[PDB]
Design a protein around this nucleic acid. Structure first.
Lengths: 150, 143, 129
RNA sequence: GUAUCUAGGACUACCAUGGUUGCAACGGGUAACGGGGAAUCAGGGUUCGAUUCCGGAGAGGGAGCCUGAGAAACGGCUACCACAUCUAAGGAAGGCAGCAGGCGCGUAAAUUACCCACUCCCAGCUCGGGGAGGUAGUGACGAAAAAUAACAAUACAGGACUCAUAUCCGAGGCCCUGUAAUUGGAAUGAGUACACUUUAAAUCCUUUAACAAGGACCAAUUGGAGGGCAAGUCUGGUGCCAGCAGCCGCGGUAAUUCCAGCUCCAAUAGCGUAUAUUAAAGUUGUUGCGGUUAAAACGUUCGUAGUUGAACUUGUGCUUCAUACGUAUGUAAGCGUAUUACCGGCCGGUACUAUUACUUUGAACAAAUUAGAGUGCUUAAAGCAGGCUUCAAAUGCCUGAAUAUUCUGUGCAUGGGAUAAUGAAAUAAGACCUCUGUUCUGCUUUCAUUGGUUUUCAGAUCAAGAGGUAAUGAUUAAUAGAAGCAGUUUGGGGGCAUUAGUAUUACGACGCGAGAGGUGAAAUUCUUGGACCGUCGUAAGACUAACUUAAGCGAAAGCAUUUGCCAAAGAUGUUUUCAUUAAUCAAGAACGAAAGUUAGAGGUUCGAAGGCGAUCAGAUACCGCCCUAGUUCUAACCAUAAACGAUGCCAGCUAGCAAUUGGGUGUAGCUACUUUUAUGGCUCUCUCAGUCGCUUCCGGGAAACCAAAGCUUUUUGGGCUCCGGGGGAAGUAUGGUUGCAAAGCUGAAACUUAAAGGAAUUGACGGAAGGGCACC
RNA sequence: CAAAAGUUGACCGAACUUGAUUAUUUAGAGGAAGUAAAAGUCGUAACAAGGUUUCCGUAGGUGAACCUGCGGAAGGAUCAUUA
RNA sequence: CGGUGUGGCCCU
């Protein structure tokens, strides 16, 4: 495991058995359907949208109170933007490569790390190219790394 | 640790044979096409040659032996051939510059005994059956 | 990566009785695998096997009686017609007496002598003795 | 559009700018006609198959073409070209890879025969004709069959036998057993030749009158005989000579291998040679090995083409009977449901179905050969013949000439619904079985014939309901993976500012005295007044010790002053998100200390090379003294190292024990005082990633060693890639390709060699460690 | 009416003569490696600590074997405590 | 801790 790495390490969540509890939660799936209309309209990513509901209210799992995945909860009220979220963190992480290595070169350890997220785009973006979540003839270009994220 | 047990893989899996046929150094004996090159009489069984001269070879160490060897020319390809006579005597059965048949030496092409650089053995001379001349079955024609 | 979910499940059973593990903790509850452990019980090779199901995959507990020698697997699923099943006996079994290779044809999963009476050609998954 | 019998870039013209490929395309190379097929064992085979069968081709080199239905024909013609024909010199003729011959050639191969009886064919044809086809002479290439004597007492030796007698011993001995040029009896058919037969005629085979063995004849060897590998340590000869001999090795004067004789053996009408080929050889391997080191992982990480991929996606039952034997269950129906729509008597016909891969029964599809069912050609190898109260007539029926594998394959039916993917319903089809239109495309019938005129019908398809019953339509998030994160963070990882620490190097100045340095020893070098020394001080560049670990970070090379900066990764934390985004990988793109070059800096220690002293026989070296390339940092450029843990990477299980890194967590812990506390430290407990070490297989190996190098055992299987088949030829040539160069990715061959090495045991209480002894 | 010779246009194209091009062969004065090397001469590298410890990527040099410098490795002779 | 090179080829 751990593709770009030597480690065998493993870190994740741990979902419980049942799919309805919290049943003691007086909160429904409907006010959180407004909360994504309230909070997710402020530009937040689908991961961190799902982290503010856990700590604050706190609903343990929105998959138990509502059936749809949260991008569909973005979409069914119209909050799915043009760009998928996780590469949008990578390309921002990719654009910080062309901010550190534009002037401070010789960092061939850092210049190793460009080859990761370019590959970690191009293997990853090939998957989303197929799934019709962004069209083909979408080619990542080097000058586009600034404006895709900004 | 390796070998390609995928099912739909066979197009790899006979290219990867032939890419390693000429590693097995006893399998280029006909495959590269060199039997017309340097098996010094041309890839047939034996050689209707002509006697050139009796040469003074010496055996390999620690064996000071003198095998009393001969020189041969061939009418098939015209090169220089060094052969060897058995059964002590028979240099008086040579009668040099004779149309001689010469076979191999029984190792599929290497120096066998203590005898270096001689990759043949005689079996016939002058079309008159060299073998039965010591036991005097056939009368040897002299002239 | 878990390449073949069949074969990895088989070998840890063989990696139990050598140090004498009478029990097996086993993963991950596929229905092709549930069609296979009872064939051992159909000739009484192992003990009681049970399956808890988490809502990811499920996992299997297997008790063992200790009568096995080795269960095996040919990989991948070679296609075998009827007239050439006997080739896979002598190369895989100690003798014609006991032991059982197990293929699966279009009718289901069975023994080879079961298949030698059912007469339908199919694909090898594994073998045991 | 032309031609062509016809498709057609066949080919002209006009037009478009394409077919093809790392799923090895185009290019060359083959001592390569394909194929039916042939030879060897347990399969899988690797070799070949010119050559009677089939098919495609050529008649010297090539090319046109007449005639005909049919040739680009050659036992038809034409050209030229090659090599040869004759001629009165003006002309004419030529292909045997048809048959039999020679010649040449090369290891390499038959009568200048007979016959149309067979089989087929030719036409005007029952009739003619056919070196097709048949037969013979040729032939140890082969395959099959099978003569070298058989029998007799005595005999001569062994034994049983009866028995004397038994550590002895013989005789009655003797079915036997041998040797017997003892004695035979002589059993015989090859040779032999009437006649016969078969044949076109003839021979030959079968039949056969007359012939036919005391061997000397009617006569078998060929090779061995040290071990492999079967069987004289017999003799003569010979003396490392001659030889022998596949290999191991025998011959160097008393030879088990040589030369002879002797006996013994081998297989036997066959033995031998050499030469290619398969088996032996599980030393070309999927089955079926190897990679720690015995030959052997690209140093490296990503990375497409490759190739392999999780799980999840209609069934157990329930009742009965056929049915094993009260019992069983392996049987079919009913029953948790397209078990399809209709007409028929449960039962025929008809409406009428997401695919593949796979497998099912098949279909089609020459034999011949292989296997082979039958079968007493005298037997066999054959071959498909023949069998038959018939015995006194034969009317005497038939069996036949099967059956599948190589008649592999692809594709063309059918069974089946496991496996293996593919396949809907998320810018919206959820459906309407349908009276169905709120579309329109009509479409052919009756309007006897026919349409202007329009409806039924709408065969119907395309809008179309608010005829919207619609659980109306979205698999789990994998101890798969990726992204997320008050997050707590970690580290000699990087970059980049800025900064510290002694030495040392001279220098500067004081002090004092002649020594200093260096060695096994000296010497090369420094020094009169000021070295070395003490001392402060100025720079100066390199290095960042100690703290340094069987620590850690990094992908590997590598990577240690502070502190700020600018990042990036790993790990735990996570009832975050995502929905297989995967693993590994040819080609390929980033990175790899020096050594080492390309200009431009900056110069301290040191320092190949170069000089000099010793040492030595020589030193061009091991030791010194001096500096020179350069290490230094900036810009790049090769890209190789023993780049090593001499072991690639990812999934799983299997054993502890002890350390320790981080992160968590529990102290039902102390300690710290800011206070008992608090943050904080340590200790214990638990925990994941481990990594080290140790333990013993109880695993595995040839062993040392190994927790994975194990699970590659059972002639075994979790994936994917390179990569080795004995040495030395050799990491050399030859070209390409790359480098400014020194050089690299790349990599053979004739030749030559029977061993080079892998760990281990033993000889070294052979200037090598540790301990003890005499005036060798 | 049919109709020879002679021949225009082509049309396919034999063979003739240059040039380039494919592999297999081939001479070659000197040049430079390999093994045969054993009765040769000069040394003594490596193997014990081989008497200067070995060993590889490369540089520079001497008759050679090798030596020498920078960066490493244990096939090393150190699995090593040493408060 | 001073040096020290060489041993013609073949004999169960």
């Amino acid at each position: 495991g751990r593709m770009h790495a030597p480690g065998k390490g493993i870190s994740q969540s741990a979902l419980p058995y049942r799919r309805t509890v919290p049943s003691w939660l007086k909160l429904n799936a409907d006010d959180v359907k407004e909360q994504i209309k309230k909070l997710g309209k402020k530009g937040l990513t689908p991961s961190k949208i799902g982290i503010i509901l856990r700590d604050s209210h706190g609903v343990a799992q929105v998959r138990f109170v509502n059936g749809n995945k949260i991008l569909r909860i973005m979409k069914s009220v119209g909050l799915k933007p043009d760009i998928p979220e996780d590469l949008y963190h990578m390309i921002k992480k990719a654009v910080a490569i062309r901010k550190h290595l534009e002037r401070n070169r010789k960092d061939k350890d850092g210049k190793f790390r460009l080859i990761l997220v370019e590959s970690r785009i191009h293997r990853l973006a090939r998957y989303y190219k197929t799934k019709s979540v962004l069209p083909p003839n979408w080619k990542y270009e080097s000058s586009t790394a600034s404006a895709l994220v900004a | 640790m390796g070998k390609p047990r995928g099912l739909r893989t066979a197009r790899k899996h006979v290219n990867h044979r032939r890419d390693q046929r000429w590693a097995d150094k006893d399998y280029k004996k006909a495959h590269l096409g060199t039997r017309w090159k340097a098996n010094p009489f041309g890839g047939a069984s034996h050689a209707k040659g002509i006697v050139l001269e009796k040469v003074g070879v010496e055996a390999k160490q620690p064996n000071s032996a003198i095998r009393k060897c001969v020189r041969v020319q061939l009418i098939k390809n015209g090169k220089k051939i060094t052969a060897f006579v058995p059964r002590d005597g028979s240099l008086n059965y040579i009668e040099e510059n004779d149309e001689v048949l010469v076979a191999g030496f029984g190792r599929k092409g290497h120096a066998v005994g203590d005898i270096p650089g001689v990759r043949f053995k005689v079996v016939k001379v002058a079309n008159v059956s060299l073998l039965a001349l010591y036991k005097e079955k056939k009368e040897r024609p002299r002239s | 990566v878990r390449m073949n979910v069949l074969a990895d499940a088989l070998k840890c059973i063989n990696n139990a009785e050598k140090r004498g593990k009478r029990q097996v903790l086993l993963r991950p509850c596929s229905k092709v695998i549930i069609k296979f452990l009872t064939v051992m019980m159909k000739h009484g090779y192992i003990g009681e096997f049970e399956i808890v199901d988490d809502h990811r995959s499920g996992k299997i507990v297997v008790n063992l009686t200790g009568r096995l020698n080795k269960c095996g697997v040919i990989s991948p699923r070679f296609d075998v017609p009827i007239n050439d099943i006997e080739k896979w006996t002598n190369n895989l079994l100690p003798s014609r007496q006991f032991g059982y290779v197990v293929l699966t044809t279009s009718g289901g999963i069975m023994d080879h002598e079961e298949a030698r009476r059912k007469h339908l050609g199919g694909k090898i998954l594994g073998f045991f003795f």
